[PDB]
Ligand binder design. Structure first.
Ligand SMILES: CC(C)c1noc(=O)[nH]1
Ligand SMILES: [Mg+2]
Lengths: 149, 151
């Protein structure tokens, strides 16, 4: 169906962008809104309401650029905003080597049903935050399965 | 002070902030503003964005060595319609010979549309505008803003 094709296109754009950033160890934070509305967080960023592309996602997260400091929030198959605030988790159960990107991802996952993707700037490692837990060192296939699920 | 007028003023402020930033950093850029001649055929050659304008997004688009930096951004009213778009190259003899493909593309689109195109040189940081087949170079910040305001 058109809806199914569009979802698969979006997943492909995301995974391509994440793979490129993982290879270059570009830190990134990408939250996908689900049933819990995230408007209050979207409003803290720079509005985009842009079509998804791997190219635009990569251009957003380039280091030392206006848009790379904060989270991208995606909603209804569009990039709603960039450079958004997310709340920092106070969980004591996050790997101690991780810093504020990962804590922000976990934090938003504590209070919403959203899925957040994190690329580490230290390692290029890819992780996902959902339900207050962080799933670390994901393969490409693992990330795709989480997005399909 | 209608909403349309205020939106235009916010868009002009975003463009001029981005162009000033890129000029200072010698970030090459090529930004075409559609007017009454539709540019769909050119917009369709790029990556679709259909994005709200911001100075931040414009700057990010043109950072060197990134996916979206080569080719034109085409704006439709208060949106960035597409990036990395193809524009036709002018063969005009009035294009300074030292200028590269971005300036020739800008003049080229300006020969077949009523659009206004802004160019930032990666060599000098100089700002130029192409309109109606003519290239106007070395614009001050004030002159660019006045040209945008008049357009
Ligand atoms: C298809 C899915 C992963 C999605 N990505 O951004 C969205 O708004 N939905
Ligand atoms: Mg002069």
């Amino acid at each position: 169906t058109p809806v199914e094709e569009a979802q698969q296109k979006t997943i492909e754009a995301i995974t391509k962008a994440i793979n490129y950033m993982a290879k270059r160890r570009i830190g990134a934070l990408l939250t996908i809104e689900r049933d819990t509305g995230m408007g209050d967080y979207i409003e803290t960023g720079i509005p985009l309401n842009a079509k998804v592309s791997s190219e635009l996602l990569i251009n957003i997260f380039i280091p030392n650029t206006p848009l790379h400091d904060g989270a991208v929030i995606m909603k209804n198959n569009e990039i709603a905003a960039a450079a958004c605030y997310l709340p920092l988790s106070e969980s004591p159960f996050i790997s101690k080597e991780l810093g504020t990107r990962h804590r922000a991802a976990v934090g938003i996952s504590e209070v919403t049903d959203s899925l957040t993707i994190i690329v580490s700037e230290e390692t290029g490692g890819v992780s996902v935050a959902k339900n207050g837990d962080l799933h670390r060192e994901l393969t490409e296939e693992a990330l795709k399965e989480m997005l399909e699920a």
